[PDB]
Ligand binder design. Structure first.
Ligand code: ATP
Ligand code: MG
Lengths: 151, 292, 387, 99, 49
């Protein structure tokens, strides 16, 4: 669990950078681990990991106890108010062995397989279109009380 | 020598493929009509099947007349078969691969080392086309040439459960098969299928070309689907029954998903790992011919 | 001076003893911080479970107490063939057979040792049953027809744990907002046809679904139950119902969990009402009849064990891990070994394959020669034909 | 009660498993009876199924509950820690005697 | 008697439990057992304690 979590943080930070359009020297396109056999909880981490939830970018999760928050995040997505995100998370949970990845990652995997024809990469892989979400949460871990000016 | 018609050997009444059902010799198509599928949230997309290897495994110097059809059918649908890659007599098919070989493949499903009296056998050209592909079953165990045993099952699902639109799409929801059922229905189904003379099917499949081939592919789609069905039950994660008001619906979850299971169960035939590798190979070759 | 003898010699002994047949458990992960033994139990739905690992206070003739002081002689007063360099003992490489045979013998005893219990518990596997009321929702409904209902207690006491074994999502609660399609999805997902009542009046199309599909509603209690349904037909009534037993085989159907073949159904039909005592007597009798073959090492191990088996229930008994927290886990497809998913009534595969044919012999009309009922009448026997 | 749920739960273990029976025969015989509607509780009824027994299975849920109770009983001494687990094994024994 | 599983009575960790059970578990006597079953149905006049 701790391993999968650290890897999910690494992949999320990397994708967070890729989506900004910056050139990256990633050592590998999908940094996160793939369970081959694990318990329930690792399958949950695999699922929210592959989702690339908006909540990470907003810093809504606390990294002080990363895996815990990650588990909690899955709990919301397992019963998410959104239908698309719920069914997507469920589907990812039921096929943990598959490596879910965005189309934009997948084209990078293609460029890699083009430059090195005999490169090995994990063969069981579904390509999902990401679900947009409009809720821009404010957030800031780190000391400082907010001084609201109420309207 | 048995002549091959303008259609396949399968056109001959001698080679009818028919599961027992409701006390009668039902055609596979009229069994598959009983089948119904509940969709689930998961999706199968079919990846390209890798081209089968150029290699034909050596037909080792074997004095005996190998019973090949029995070996294949038991490896695919056999209730009790295991360690199917230990003996490795599948390689023997490559004895038939050579031009003007003395060896004959009898209708009995035996590979005689030389033509012998009062044993009818398939036309050697046809068998050569058939061996040029299916001898590769003989390298189903060798590490370099093993088939993927996970992704290939997607094709199985599409070729079985898939509606024509799902087949055109190349992507269908993972499904859950069900049918009104008698006791031991899948065991009996698989045993009705082990008795099928499938080398007739595979030989017409490899020998026929042009419209005569395509006319075969439509005519025997349901047969191929029955073979695929038995394999599907062999690899299904679970196979329950449902009470439905004094009737029972057998239900397998899930079509198109290999669970990699190997512990035996009463409901259906089970694959040992060797049978998994073999079946994966068989599907590789057969689906390759089926989509060309 | 002895490190040479441990690392280069004891280690190969440990390495082979690890492969011995009866050494079946994983012993240690190498992480003191996190290791705990996997904790299997032989759970039954209709009994209390037995942990395999237990602090049961049997000492096995003192084998369980550990004298750590044993390290002192090891370090300080023992010779080893490698330690002795310079004389040369020449290493011993013991014949496999002497242990192998022993293992076999044990494995061969404990194999067939449970057979008679396994056979009877296979027969009676579908035989547990819940009391259920069947309210009639419309005029001219035979007492078998109508909506079916059981108390939450009965569901919790039989149906639930069996769902956990069968490894399915818990059945949906019905709230009166429930469309028939939702109940349909529920029964499709958990193959037993059961839903739990929760709250609110249940709409009539749903009632037609529950009636037409023989779904078993699990009422919290039988208090003013007709208020719970939208009896627009005004036929359903609190006094109008029929109590009856409902066998576990009549709701569940799973080939390796619960025998459900019609033959064994008829066998149960012919059985007298039973009790754990009667069942145990049957098993003791089948054991009395088949006196098993045993190699001398098997007789030895048998007397070592070496007596009671009677206590544990086996009604639908399965092998399943508990959490250390004490909860009995569901079979995890990615953890627990595949053989544990269904104890096949603890019978061998060939025994099942034969067993089916036996069901075919039993159900056969020609051997069905116990006759029921009779007709007193005062005719002359002019032309005697038995038929 | 609002927050004494475990206590109400355990108290439910004491609920009788029988049925109230009107004294039909004594009434037909015109036997003396102080109540305007004579009846007596019968502690338990006939087993209805072929194999399962409602009484025994009830005692089984009772000892399940009691084992959950004993398991949650925090203790300080090591010996108490032992007697807890032994108590749990003993309950698992009682259930079989009762069945 | 059948108060304890084998071999919980022998076990040294069970000692407190076993003494508890032994302090509760009375010896069987037909007259006392019969009296209990009969008390269940017999009318009570002097209140029981
Ligand atoms: N986050 C999740 N993702 C996928 N499935 C879940 C999740 N949470 C629960 N489940 C499903 O429910 C079952 C667990 O039940 P439950 O949620 O009551 O307890 P849990 O495992 O502690 O999870 P939670 O912490 O959400 O309570 C699992 O078998 C799983 O299939
Ligand atoms: Mg790295």
């Amino acid at each position: 669990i701790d391993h999968f979590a650290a890897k999910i943080l690494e992949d999320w930070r990397q994708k967070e950078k890729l989506d900004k359009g910056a050139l990256v020297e990633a050592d590998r396109v999908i940094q996160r681990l793939i369970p081959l056999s694990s318990s329930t909880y690792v399958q949950r981490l695999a699922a929210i990991g592959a989702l690339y939830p908006n909540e990470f970018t907003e810093n809504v999760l606390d990294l002080s106890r990363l895996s815990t928050a990650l588990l909690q995040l899955s709990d919301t997505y397992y019963q998410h108010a959104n239908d698309q995100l719920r069914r997507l998370y469920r589907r990812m949970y039921n096929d943990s062995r598959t490596l879910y990845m965005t189309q934009r990652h997948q084209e990078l995997l293609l460029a890699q397989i083009t430059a090195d024809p005999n490169i090995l990469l994990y063969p069981y892989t579904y390509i999902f279109t990401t679900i947009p979400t409009s809720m821009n949460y404010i957030s800031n871990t780190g000391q400082g009380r907010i001084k609201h000016s109420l309207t | 020598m048995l002549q091959q018609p303008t259609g396949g050997y399968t056109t001959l009444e001698q080679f009818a493929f028919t599961i027992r059902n409701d006390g009668t010799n039902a055609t596979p198509t009229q069994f598959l009509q009983l089948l119904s599928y509940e969709a689930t949230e998961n999706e199968l997309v079919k990846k390209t099947i890798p081209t089968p290897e150029t290699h034909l495994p050596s037909a080792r110097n074997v004095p005996g007349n190998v019973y090949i059809e029995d070996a294949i059918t038991q490896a695919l649908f056999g209730i009790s078969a295991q360690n199917v890659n230990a003996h490795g007599y599948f390689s023997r098919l490559s004895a038939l691969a050579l031009p003007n070989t003395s060896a004959r493949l009898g209708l009995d499903g035996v590979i005689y080392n030389s033509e012998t009296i009062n044993i009818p056998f398939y036309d050697p050209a046809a068998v050569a086309n058939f061996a040029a592909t299916y001898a590769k079953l003989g390298n189903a165990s060798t590490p370099r040439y093993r088939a993927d045993m996970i992704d290939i099952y997607a094709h199985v699902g599409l070729e079985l459960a898939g509606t024509d639109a799902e087949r055109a799409a190349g992507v269908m929801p993972v499904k859950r098969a069900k049918f009104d059922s008698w006791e031991g229905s899948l065991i009996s189904l698989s045993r009705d299928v082990v008795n099928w003379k499938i080398l007739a099917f595979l030989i017409d499949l490899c020998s026929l070309e042009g419209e005569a081939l395509r006319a075969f592919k439509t005519r025997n789609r349901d047969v191929f689907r029955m073979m695929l069905f038995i394999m599907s039950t062999a690899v299904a994660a679970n196979v329950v029954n449902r009470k439905v008001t004094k009737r029972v619906d057998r239900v397998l979850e899930y079509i198109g998903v290999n669970s990699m299971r190997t512990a035996g169960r009463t409901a259906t035939i089970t694959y040992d790992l060797s049978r998994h590798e073999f079946a994966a190979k068989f599907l590789q070759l057969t689906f390759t011919r089926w989509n060309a | 001076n002895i490190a040479v003898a441990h690392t280069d010699h004891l280690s190969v002994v440990y390495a082979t003893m690890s492969n011995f047949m009866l050494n079946f458990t994983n012993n240690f992960s190498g992480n003191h911080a996190t290791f705990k033994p996997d904790q299997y139990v032989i759970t039954s739905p209709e009994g209390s479970y037995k942990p395999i690992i237990e602090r049961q206070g049997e000492t096995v003739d003192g084998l369980t107490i550990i004298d750590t002081s044993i390290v002192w002689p090891i370090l300080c007063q023992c010779t080893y063939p490698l330690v002795r360099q310079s004389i040369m003992e020449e290493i011993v490489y013991p014949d496999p057979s002497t242990t192998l045979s022993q293992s076999l013998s044990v494995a061969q005893v404990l194999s067939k040792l449970t057979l008679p219990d396994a056979f009877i518990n296979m027969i009676l596997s579908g035989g547990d049953s819940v009391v259920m009321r069947t309210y009639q929702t419309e005029a001219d409904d035979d007492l078998d027809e109508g909506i079916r209902m059981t108390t939450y207690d009965q569901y919790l006491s039989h149906i639930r744990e069996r769902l956990h074994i069968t490894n399915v999502p818990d059945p949906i609660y019905i709230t009166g907002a429930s469309t028939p399609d939702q109940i349909a999805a529920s029964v499709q997902a958990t193959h037993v046809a059961v839903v739990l009542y929760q709250s609110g009046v249940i709409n009539g199309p749903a009632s037609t679904y529950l009636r037409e599909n023989e779904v078993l509603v699990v009422m919290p209690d039988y208090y003013d139950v007709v208020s719970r349904f939208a009896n627009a037909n005004l036929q359903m009534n609190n006094n109008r119902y029929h109590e009856s037993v409902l066998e576990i085989a009549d709701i569940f159907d799973q080939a390796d969990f619960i025998q459900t073949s019609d033959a064994v159904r008829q066998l149960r039909a012919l059985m007298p009402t039973l009790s754990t005592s009667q069942i145990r007597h049957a098993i003791e009798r089948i054991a009395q009849i088949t006196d098993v073959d045993s190699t001398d090492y098997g007789k030895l191990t048998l007397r070592f064990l070496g007596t009671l088996t009677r206590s544990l229930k086996m009604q639908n008994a399965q092998i399943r891990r508990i959490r250390p927290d004490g909860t009995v886990l569901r079979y995890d497809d990615q953890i627990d070994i595949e053989a544990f998913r269904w104890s096949r009534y603890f019978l061998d595969e060939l025994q099942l394959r034969r067993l089916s044919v036996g069901l075919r012999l039993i159900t056969n009309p020609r051997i069905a020669r116990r006759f029921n009922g009779v007709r007193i009448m005062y005719l002359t026997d002019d032309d005697p034909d038995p038929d | 009660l609002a927050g004494a749920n475990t206590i109400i739960a355990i108290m439910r273990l004491f609920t009788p498993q029988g049925f109230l029976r009107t004294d039909d025969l004594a009434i037909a015989a015109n036997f003396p009876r102080a109540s305007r509607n004579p009846q007596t509780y019968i502690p338990y009824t006939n087993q209805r199924g072929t194999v399962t027994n409602e009484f025994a299975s009830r005692f089984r849920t009772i000892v399940a509950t009691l084992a959950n109770v004993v398991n949650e009983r925090a203790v300080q001494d090591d010996m108490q820690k032992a007697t807890r687990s032994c108590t749990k094994q003993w309950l698992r024994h009682l259930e079989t005697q009762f069945d | 008697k059948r108060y304890f599983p084998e071999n919980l009575e022998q076990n040294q960790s069970a000692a407190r439990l076993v003494s508890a059970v032994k302090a509760r578990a009375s010896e069987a006597d037909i007259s006392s057992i019969h009296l209990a079953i009969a008390r269940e149905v017999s009318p009570m006049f002097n209140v029981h304690e």
